[PDB]
Design an enzyme around this catalytic site. Sequence first.
Site, PDB file in Angstrom:
ATOM      1  N   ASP A  10      30.746  37.032  39.149  1.00  0.00           N
ATOM      2  CA  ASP A  10      32.216  36.945  39.192  1.00  0.00           C
ATOM      3  C   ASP A  10      32.797  37.020  37.771  1.00  0.00           C
ATOM      4  OD1 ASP A  10      34.921  36.191  40.108  1.00  0.00           O
ATOM      5  OD2 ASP A  10      34.395  34.238  39.300  1.00  0.00           O
ATOM      6  N   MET A  11      34.060  37.387  37.563  1.00  0.00           N
ATOM      7  CA  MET A  11      34.678  37.446  36.254  1.00  0.00           C
ATOM      8  C   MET A  11      35.432  36.202  35.857  1.00  0.00           C
ATOM      9  SD  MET A  11      35.690  41.524  36.267  1.00  0.00           S
ATOM     10  CE  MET A  11      36.468  41.432  34.645  1.00  0.00           C
ATOM     11  N   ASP A  12      36.614  35.909  36.442  1.00  0.00           N
ATOM     12  CA  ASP A  12      37.374  34.732  35.921  1.00  0.00           C
ATOM     13  C   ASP A  12      36.751  33.412  36.208  1.00  0.00           C
ATOM     14  OD1 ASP A  12      39.784  36.200  34.907  1.00  0.00           O
ATOM     15  OD2 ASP A  12      39.598  37.122  36.858  1.00  0.00           O
ATOM     16  N   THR A  44      34.434  40.930  41.837  1.00  0.00           N
ATOM     17  CA  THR A  44      35.692  40.215  41.508  1.00  0.00           C
ATOM     18  C   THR A  44      36.819  40.525  42.469  1.00  0.00           C
ATOM     19  OG1 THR A  44      37.329  40.051  39.661  1.00  0.00           O
ATOM     20  CG2 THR A  44      36.344  42.210  39.980  1.00  0.00           C
ATOM     21  N   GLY A  45      37.776  39.555  42.521  1.00  0.00           N
ATOM     22  CA  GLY A  45      39.054  39.753  43.173  1.00  0.00           C
ATOM     23  C   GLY A  45      39.976  40.708  42.444  1.00  0.00           C
ATOM     24  N   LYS A 198      33.406  39.024  49.241  1.00  0.00           N
ATOM     25  CA  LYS A 198      32.421  39.405  48.187  1.00  0.00           C
ATOM     26  C   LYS A 198      31.025  39.528  48.724  1.00  0.00           C
ATOM     27  CE  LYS A 198      34.822  37.576  44.108  1.00  0.00           C
ATOM     28  NZ  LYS A 198      34.621  36.785  42.817  1.00  0.00           N
ATOM     29  N   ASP A 221      32.143  30.620  40.870  1.00  0.00           N
ATOM     30  CA  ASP A 221      32.801  29.335  40.560  1.00  0.00           C
ATOM     31  C   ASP A 221      33.751  28.878  41.620  1.00  0.00           C
ATOM     32  OD1 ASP A 221      34.735  31.371  39.405  1.00  0.00           O
ATOM     33  OD2 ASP A 221      35.941  29.566  39.162  1.00  0.00           O
ATOM     34  N   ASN A 224      36.191  31.801  46.882  1.00  0.00           N
ATOM     35  CA  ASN A 224      35.932  33.188  47.230  1.00  0.00           C
ATOM     36  C   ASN A 224      34.575  33.683  46.734  1.00  0.00           C
ATOM     37  OD1 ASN A 224      36.764  33.404  44.504  1.00  0.00           O
ATOM     38  ND2 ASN A 224      37.545  35.467  44.830  1.00  0.00           N
TER      39      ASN A 224
HETATM   40 CL   LIG Z   1      37.786  36.516  41.917  1.00  0.00          CL
HETATM   41 MG   LIG Z   2      36.167  33.022  39.508  1.00  0.00          MG
END
Ligand SMILES: [Cl-]
Ligand SMILES: [Mg+2]
Length: 271
Positions: A10-12, A44-45, A198, A221, A224
Amino acid sequence: SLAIKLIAIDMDGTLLLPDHTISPAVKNAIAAARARGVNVVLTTGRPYAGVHNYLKELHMEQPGDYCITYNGALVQKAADGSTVAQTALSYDDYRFLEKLSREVGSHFHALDRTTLYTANRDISYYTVHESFVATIPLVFCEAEKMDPNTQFLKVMMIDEPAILDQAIARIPQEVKEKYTVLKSAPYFLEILDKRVNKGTGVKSLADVLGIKPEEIMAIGDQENDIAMIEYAGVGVAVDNAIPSVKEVANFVTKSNLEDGVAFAIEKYVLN
Ligand SMILES: [Cl-]
Ligand SMILES: [Mg+2]
């Protein structure tokens, strides 16, 4: 046991520091895993607009590089952004969810392949945040003037946390059954077609590539990320993950602030 062949990240909150950069430790661990032939897929979202500069920073430009964007509604080739799989919400689903957001008291915005739209005249801080940080153009348009052939990859209810959590408590359980409805941050609720998330995105790509679940590591984290951490053979939560994500992980690594992605790559892949 089998060796890891694919790492979904995941990114953020996970790959990226709070200033939206990738630390040198994490860039060197991802380069070491790709030099060994291990495929690394940002999952990622974010819209693709918020991903392609990081793909170029990570040198994800080879024919066998992929990304998973819009929370799994889009699977793409990383070299040129071309589509490998898509499932979009309909126009009727957009109008239903736009009205639901006004009943439950949250701001709302919608994304297609290139653009971020809102019908809120008092535009949330978190719609300006998505436009600025994910580098995606912003367009104001009333719900009843949206083109009915817009390809709605995902929508989101976004707001101050107290407002968004109040709104979530007012959504009926039927909606949470009908669509994929998952938080990605205290201020972001991701909503997309129920067929995609995901976890489906990572499984789609693993089946294209002949990779078994056992050979996948997934790192995340927030709510999602739970389904991809459950699907993977190695599911990893950063230490800044919410409790429900640590509960389903095989391993809790360091926070994003302390290079948890690099520490996980060293544990399961490089050593
Ligand atoms: Cl995300
Ligand atoms: Mg995240």
